[PDB]
Amino acid sequence: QLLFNKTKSVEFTFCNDTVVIPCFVTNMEAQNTTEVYVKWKFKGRDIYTFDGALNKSTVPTDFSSAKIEVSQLLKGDASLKMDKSDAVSHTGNYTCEVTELTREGETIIELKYRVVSWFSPNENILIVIFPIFAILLFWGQFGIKTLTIALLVAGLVITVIVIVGAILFVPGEYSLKNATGLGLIVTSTGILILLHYYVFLTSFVIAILVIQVIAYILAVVGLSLCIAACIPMHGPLLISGLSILALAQLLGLVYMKFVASNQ
Amino acid sequence: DIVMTQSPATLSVTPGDRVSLSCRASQTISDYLHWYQQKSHESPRLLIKFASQSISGIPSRFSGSGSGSDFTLSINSVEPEDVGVYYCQNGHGFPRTFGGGTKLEIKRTVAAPSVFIFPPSDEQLKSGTASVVCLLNNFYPREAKVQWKVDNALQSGNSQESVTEQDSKDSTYSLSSTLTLSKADYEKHKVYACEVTHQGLSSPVTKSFNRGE
Amino acid sequence: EVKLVESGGDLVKPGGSLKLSCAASGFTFSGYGMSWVRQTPDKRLEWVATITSGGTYTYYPDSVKGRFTISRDNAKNTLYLQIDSLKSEDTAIYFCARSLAGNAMDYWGQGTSVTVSSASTKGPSVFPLAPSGTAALGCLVKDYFPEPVTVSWNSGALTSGVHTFPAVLQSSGLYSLSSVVTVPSSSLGTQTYICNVNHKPSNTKVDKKVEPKS
Ligand SMILES: *[C@@H]1O[C@H](CO)[C@@H](O)[C@H](O)[C@H]1NC(C)=O
Ligand SMILES: *[C@@H]1O[C@H](CO)[C@@H](O)[C@H](O)[C@H]1NC(C)=O
Ligand SMILES: *[C@@H]1O[C@H](CO)[C@@H](O)[C@H](O)[C@H]1NC(C)=O
Ligand SMILES: *[C@@H]1O[C@H](CO)[C@@H](O)[C@H](O)[C@H]1NC(C)=O
C-alpha cells in the first residue's frame, strides 16, 4: 500500500496563472511508466488519466488544460497542473489515485480559492487615505490663504481625479482599472507637489518641498515596481512616499496658520 | 486476501446472441478490473483492462462495464470462435486474484457422429494386450452413449471414454472409447462391436469386425 | 509481434527444485514488468510472482510461503522463476506474462508443465490405428506417466482434421490417449502418414508410420 506526503489543502489567487495540486508518493518502486497508472478524480468524476503502458493522457472537455509531468512520475511526483480558468470553476476535494504492479494508493487534497485583490487590505486602505488627507489639507491652506483662480482651477480637478483615481482603484482583482486608478492617484499627488509650492521663501519651505519631492519620486519609482504584475511585494515605498507627502502638506497647513496671524 | 467470484459457472449461448458475464469482488476496487479469455489448447489473452478499456486487436463485440464491486463482460453477438473460459482479475487489492472462471459453451443444430472402429495393432498384441478403439467424430450435443459387444455379449468395466473439447469452428465434439482386453481374452472371441446411440441417430449405429478378417 | 516462451517444466520428486526460463522477443524486455502465473489442473489461475522492469523489486502472494524466487537477465532477454521445496500442490502449467499497471498481463506464453509426483516417469508405448471417400487413422499412445504427451502429424504438416484426445487416468495410474485424423482414402500408399509422439519426462519420441494392415 502506497504512502504520500500528506497535504491538507492549497490556496490559489487571481494571479496564479498555472495551478498545481501536489501528490507525492514516498515509497514508489516502479522502474518504468509502463508499470504505472494515475487517475485524478474531482467530485466523483475521472478528470485526468495517465496510462503508463500506452502513455495516453486523457481528460474531459471540462479540464482540457490538465496535465502531470510524466518526467517526474517515477520519482513519486504525480502532481496535477491546470490553467487558472479551469481551476477557478472547480474548487473542491481532488483525489489522486496512483497504481503500480502490486501496490496502489490514493490521497485527497482540497483546492481552496481566496481573493486579496491586488494589494492586501491594509496596503490599499493606506495609499487611498494619505493622498486624500493630503489634498483635504491643501484645501485648508487654499481656504485660509484665499480668506489666484489658477490654484482653485487646478484645485477642483485634483480632488476630482483623486475621487476618480481612488474609485477606479479598489474594485476588482488587479485590473488596468486599478493600475490606472493608482496612476491617476500618484499623478494627482504629482501635481499636488506643484500646487503646494504655489503659495508666495522661508528656510521652512525649501525643506518641506525638497523632502516632498524626494518622497514623491520615491513614491513614483516606488510604483514603477508595483504596476507590473499582481501580488507586488513592493508596497511600503508607495505608502511611505505618500506618507511624507501627506505630512509635508501637514507642515504646510499649520506653518501658514502661524503666518496668517502673526504679521 | 480479497475473493473474486464469477457468475455464471457455465453457460450455453446461440451464436449471434448477446451474453453478460458477472464478476464480484469482496471489496471496492474502483474500475481496476481486467478480463481475459482462454480457448482450450491456448493460453489466456487480455480482452479488457481497467473495467472498460478495450485492447488492440480484440473484436469490437467485447466490452467491459461496472465499477466498485460488481462488473460485467458483455459479448454483443457471440461467435462459435468465442467458445472458451473467461476470467476476471482484480487490479486493486492484494493479491492479484483471478476469478473462478466462466465456461462459455456454444449451442448449435444437432449433428450425427461419423463412427469408426479400430481393431488392435498386432504390435500391441505381441506385447500381450489388445485394445479396440471406437471413434465418434464431429457430433452435437456432447452427450452420447457407447456400448461394447463381444460376440453380442454386452461388456462392462473394461472401456474408457474421452471427449474432445468443443471445436471453435464447427462447435462439435469428438469421442474415443477404448476397450481393453488381454491377448488371450481377445483371441478367444471373433466378433467385436461398437454400439453408438446419439440424439441425431434414428437408430443405434454399430461398427463391428471379425478378428483378423 | 510479441512472443513469450517458457521452458524447464518437468516431472520432479516432491521436495525437489526446478528453474523455469522465459524467453522474451518483440519488445523492449527491460522496459516492462513481468509476472509468473500458474494454472492448476482444476483450470483455476493463480498469480505466483511479479518483478519490476529493473529487476530491483519483486512481489509474491503469501500462498507459496516464499518458495518461488523470480529474476530477470535484461541482457539475454530472459525472465526466470526458481521454484524450490516443490509440493504436490504445485503441479500446474506455468505462464510468464508481460505486466502493465494493476498487473494487467497483456501477453502470455504458451505454458510449461510442472508435475510433482512420488511416481517415476514411464514412457508411452505407441501403436497404429490402421484405417479400414474418407478414411480415419490414428495413434494409440498407451501406458505413460506423467502428463502430458504431445502429438503432431507428419512433423506438424497435418493439422486439418486432427483430434488429439484428452488423456484418461487408468486403473494402473498410467495414462492412455489416442490421436486420430480423418484423411481422403485416395491418398493412402501415395502419401505417408506418421504420428509424432513426444513424452518429454521419459525422453520418449516415437515417430510411428501409420499404415493399412497386410
Ligand atoms: C500560487 O502562487 C504561489 C506563489 O508562491 C504558490 O506558492 C502557490 O502554491 C501557487 N499555486 C497554488 C495552487 O496555490
Ligand atoms: C509517449 O512518450 C513520449 C516520450 O516517451 C512522449 O513525448 C509522447 O508524446 C508520448 N505519446 C503520446 C501519445 O502522448
Ligand atoms: C473537503 O473535505 C473536507 C474534510 O475532508 C471538508 O472539511 C471540506 O468542507 C470539503 N469540501 C471542500 C469544498 O473543501
Ligand atoms: C522504459 O521503456 C522504454 C521503451 O522504449 C525505454 O526506452 C525507457 O528508457 C525505459 N525506462 C524509463 C525509466 O524510461
User: B132 with B39, same domain?
Assistant: no
| β pairing state of A9-12 and A104-113 | parallel
Q: How far is it, in rounded angstroms, from Cα B51 to Cα B33?
A: 5
* Cα–Cα distance list, A254 to A131, A137, A257, C25, C125 (Å): 18, 10, 5, 95, 128
A131 three-class SS: helix
Record: contact A34-C100, CB cut-off 8 A: yes
Last residue of a domain, one of B61, B88, B106: B106
Within 10 angstroms of residue C117's Cβ, the number of other Cβ atoms is: 17
User: B88 with B153, same domain?
Assistant: no
Q: How far is it, in rounded angstroms, from Cα A197 to Cα A251?
A: 12
- Asked whether the beta carbons of B50 and A37 are under 8 A apart, the reply is yes
Q: How far is it, in rounded angstroms, from Cα C214 to Cα C198?
A: 27
Give the residue from chain A lying closest to B55, CA to CA.
A54
CA distance A163 to chain B (A): 60
Solving technique for this entry?
A: X-ray
What is the DSSP secondary structure assignment for residue B121, as one 8-state letter? P
Record: contact B50-A37, CB cut-off 8 A: yes
Across the interface, which of B43, B97, B118 has its CB nearest the CB of C129?
B118
Record: contact B97-C47, CB cut-off 8 A: yes
Give the residue from chain A lying closest to B95, CA to CA.
A102
Distance from chain centroid for Cα A244: 24
What is the resolution in angstroms?
3.4
User: B98 with B33, same domain?
Assistant: yes
Last residue of a domain, one of B43, B77, B106: B106
**What's the A79 CA to ligand 2 centre distance in angstroms?**
18
| Alpha-carbon dihedral angle through residues B140, B145, B150, B151, given to the nearest 10 degrees | -90
Across the interface, which of C104, C180, C182 has its CB nearest the CB of B91?
C104
**What's the A13 CA to ligand 1 centre distance in angstroms?**
8
Q: Hey, is the C-beta of B46 within 8 angstroms of any chain A C-beta?
A: no
Last residue of a domain, one of B64, B82, B106: B106
Residue A55 belongs to what domain range? 9-113
What would the DSSP string read from start to end of A137-179?
A: HHHHHHHHHH---HHHHHHHHHHHHHHHHHHHSSSSSS-HHHH
CATH number at residue A17: 2.60.40.10
- Given the CA of residue C31, which atom of ligand 4 is nearest to it? 2
Residue A250 CB–ligand 1 contact under 6 Å: no
Write a three-state SS string for C165-185. Answer: CCCEECCCCCEEEEEEEEEEC
Record: contact C176-B135, CB cut-off 8 A: no
**What's the A112 CA to ligand 3 centre distance in angstroms?**
9
- Given the CA of residue A92, which atom of ligand 3 is nearest to it? 13
**Dihedrals phi, psi of B38, to nearest 5 degrees:** -135, 110
A23 three-class SS: coil
Residue B169 belongs to what domain range? 114-210
**Nearest alpha-carbon partner for B6 in B104, B103, B105, B99:** B99
Return the C-alpha cell found at C75. 541482457
Record: contact C101-A102, CB cut-off 8 A: no
CATH number at residue B80: 2.60.40.10
Q: Hey, is the C-beta of A11 within 8 angstroms of any chain C C-beta?
A: no
User: B155 with B194, same domain?
Assistant: yes
What would the DSSP string read from start to end of chain C?
A: --EEEEE---EE-TT--EEEEEEEESS-GGGSEEEEEEE-TT--EEEEEEE-TTSS-EE--GGGTT-EEEEEETTTTEEEEEE-S--GGG-EEEEEEEE-GGG-EEEE---EEEEE-SSPPBPPEEEEE----EEEEEEEEEEEBSS--EEEEGGGT--TTEEEPPPEE-TTS-EEEEEEEEEETTSTTSS--EEEEEEGGGTEEEEEE-----
Structural domains of chain C, ranges and CATH numbers in brackets: 11-116 (2.60.40.10), 125-210 (2.60.40.10)
B98 three-class SS: strand
CA atoms within 13 A on the CB side of A21: 31
Q: How many domains, in total, are found in chain B?
A: 2
* Helix segments in B104-173, DSSP class H: 122-127
Q: How far is it, in rounded angstroms, from Cα B48 to Cα B199?
A: 39
**What's the A108 CA to ligand 1 centre distance in angstroms?**
18
User: B8 with B96, same domain?
Assistant: yes
Q: Which of C6, C35, C100, C140 to mutate to test the interface with B (most CBs of B within 10 A)?
A: C140
Record: contact C50-B32, CB cut-off 8 A: no
User: B76 with B154, same domain?
Assistant: no
CB pairs under 8 A between B and C: 121
E strands, chain B, are: 4-7, 12-13, 19-25, 33-38, 45-49, 53-54, 62-66, 70-75, 84-90, 102-106, 114-118, 129-139, 145-150, 159-163, 173-182, 191-197, 205-210
Residue A230 CB–ligand 1 contact under 6 Å: no
Q: Hey, is the C-beta of B58 within 8 angstroms of any chain C C-beta?
A: no
Q: Hey, is the C-beta of B165 within 8 angstroms of any chain C C-beta?
A: yes
B212 three-class SS: coil
Within 10 angstroms of residue C11's Cβ, the number of other Cβ atoms is: 21
Return the C-alpha cell found at B85. 473460459
What would the DSSP string read from start to end of B162-194?
A: EEPPPPSSS--EEEEEEEEEEHHHHHH--EEEE
Record: contact B44-C63, CB cut-off 8 A: no
**Residue bearing cell 451464436:** B15
Within 10 angstroms of residue B49's Cβ, the number of other Cβ atoms is: 27
User: B85 with B138, same domain?
Assistant: no
User: B68 with B162, same domain?
Assistant: no
Q: How far is it, in rounded angstroms, from Cα A82 to Cα B8?
A: 45
A10 three-class SS: strand
Interface of A with B in 126-165 (CB under 8 A): none
Give the residue from chain A lying closest to C103, CA to CA.
A101
Peptide bond into C124 cis (omega under 30): no
